[PDB]
């Protein structure tokens, strides 16, 4: 009832092997057990051969399909991989369809979720070129779907992330903090702040880059959602050296996050909380900048919050700003979920 | 890098080889933030989950030692739980037999309710609050406690999750344990009828006609300081509703209480004292002559040359209001 069902995309009838795909792609939409009831039957290599068929109506709806199996565990998207599925969702990143480009790009955002190498079997596979070039494009529902799939590949190992710099992503995303659409917006502080999640020559990119005045203005805004993902840069910034935790005080942002450590809104405080916390992970010039900006006496106060959560990371960052050590910095790495 | 090595080992057959692999992962995610969404990332949810069932006590005990460790985590990795279906296990294991497990999936419960409202009402449509009201009748007070640790931390969600734990039935036995012997057991019981009554004025109705009132003002003459602030927060969020509310308070004669607070050497003690009196400040001018009535205008006259600035001004806020807040608590197992 289901091999049967495999045979069927072999069937030179397009009215057969279209409605054999609408039944392998909802009973793919269900669990990720009925998700290897499909890879079981041997259904990838039909799936990836189509592909290349000449049919948009067959090959709309194998990328519906082959999609739905990445949602499932890693286990299950390594399966799509060496299926040989990169090679053809790259290919179709130059599709004159735009549903067929933003299928292949949703494709590649949830292929893009597992883990670094295979991440990586992404970027070997050429994605990165056509996935910077699209940064630039003036249908905002194409960039959104490109900005999705490049942040996920943001959130792997150095190797991932330098990958990412070396196509040339920084100058459209920094320009991109300039965008009206606010999920545009948010979507590229997500690809930024992933960015400076890895080392201390990555972060340095993005400081170089010039992204820090603009992260500044942003703790400003009236979105919440955008204060958010602009926190979290911030944060992963902090969570370098000695140098690139001091441009972000060059920056000006020490007077905007001690004046957020008293939101109402707790998941703004927390995130306030967490780059303070980061910067009071540096050297003692850096810990000197955060007392000047008076968060000694806020971080006291914290610790009668009616969150006792907040209290114990009110703890965690009074303790670091009263030490003669500089490491605890911690980093984040955050997905972009279709 | 042998985490993904320690998550494949959950999977190992041998109690020894699963039972090592169990203990590293929890005092890993014992760390930090960025120590559990590791643990996270390696896929270590679903096995754990899966090991909820798992007949030997032992194992389910290091498996909710570990689940209890990443819901300590941020309110997005609190989620990464909940999608990976450990509420409907959590509430399972409410009606074990061992006492340990019963307590240990308490936790996992309470560190979940501390995260957003919606996260909340998921445990409460798993079915909890019913297996939690039951609890709180039972003879074990460490039983007790983690059923009111969770249950506080579920009041203090939206007026949806605080009306969801009126309509179990909290509010008779949380009355109750307000003639508790036990410290711990009361302050747990003031900070979910606390949280209770930072809803609607329906909902601090609830808690008036609960008669709850007159166990409050007498536990401000509680020489336990401890219980003395679980006390006046609760009555600071009553006096938050409308005048009808605020007079009830009045009315259960905590006038005088209040006004003499306001001299108790302790800070934290004479700022929630101000804290009531400016949320019953808030109403009309019937509940304002009673304040003053009540020898407040000279102490608040007193503290403005307190040595505590922020205590300052906070008299002269309450002082010229006389010539409206709320406050939602989460704690945390302890």
């Keep these: 009832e289901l091999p049967q069902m495999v045979?069927?995309?072999?069937?030179?009838?397009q009215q057969e092997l279209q409605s054999a795909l609408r039944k392998l792609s909802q009973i793919a939409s269900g669990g990720n057990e009925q998700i290897q009831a499909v890879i079981d039957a041997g259904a990838l290599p039909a799936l990836v051969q189509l592909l290349s068929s000449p049919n948009e109506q067959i090959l709309q709806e194998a990328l519906w399909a082959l999609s739905n199996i990445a949602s499932g565990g890693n286990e299950q998207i390594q399966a799509v991989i060496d299926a040989g599925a990169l090679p053809a969702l790259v290919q179709l990143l130059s599709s004159p369809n735009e549903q067929i480009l933003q299928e292949a790009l949703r494709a590649l955002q949830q292929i893009a979720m597992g883990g670094n190498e295979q991440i990586q079997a992404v970027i070997d596979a050429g994605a990165l070129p056509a996935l910077v070039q699209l940064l630039s494009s003036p249908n905002e529902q194409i960039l959104a779907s490109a900005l999705g799939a490049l942040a996920n590949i943001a959130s792997g190992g150095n190797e991932q992330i330098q990958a990412v710099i070396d196509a040339g992503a920084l100058?459209?995303?920094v320009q991109l903090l300039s965008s009206p659409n606010?999920?545009?917006?948010?979507?590229?502080?997500?690809?930024?702040?992933?960015?400076?999640?890895?080392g201390n020559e990555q972060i340095q990119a993005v400081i170089d880059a010039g992204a820090l005045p603009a992260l500044v203005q942003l703790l400003s805004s009236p979105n919440e959602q955008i204060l958010?993902?602009?926190?979290?840069?911030?944060?992963?910034?902090?969570?370098?050296?000695?140098?690139?935790?001091?441009?972000?005080?060059?920056?000006?942002?020490?007077?905007?996050?001690?004046?957020?450590?008293?939101?109402?809104?707790?998941?703004?405080?927390?995130?306030a909380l967490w780059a303070l916390?980061?910067?009071?992970?540096?050297?003692?010039?850096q810990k000197q900048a955060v007392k000047e900006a008076?968060?000694?006496?806020?971080?006291?106060?914290?610790?009668?919050?009616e969150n006792e959560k907040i209290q114990k990371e009110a703890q965690e960052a009074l303790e670091k700003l009263?030490?003669?050590?500089?490491?605890?910095?911690?980093?984040?790495?955050?997905?972009?979920?279709?």
């Design 322 to 338: 009263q030490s003669h050590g500089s490491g605890g910095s911690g980093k984040r790495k955050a997905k972009i979920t279709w």
């Design 7 to 13: 045979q069927q995309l072999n069937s030179p009838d």
């Design 277 to 285: 916390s980061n910067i009071a992970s540096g050297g003692n010039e």
């Design 182 to 198: 606010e999920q545009i917006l948010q979507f590229a502080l997500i690809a930024l702040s992933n960015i400076a999640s890895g």
């Design 294 to 305: 008076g968060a000694l006496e806020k971080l006291e106060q914290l610790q009668s919050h």
């Design 171 to 173: 100058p459209a995303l």
């Design 228 to 271: 958010q993902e602009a926190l979290w840069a911030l944060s992963n910034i902090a969570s370098g050296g000695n140098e690139q935790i001091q441009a972000v005080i060059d920056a000006g942002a020490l007077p905007a996050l001690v004046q957020l450590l008293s939101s109402p809104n707790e998941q703004i405080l927390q995130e």
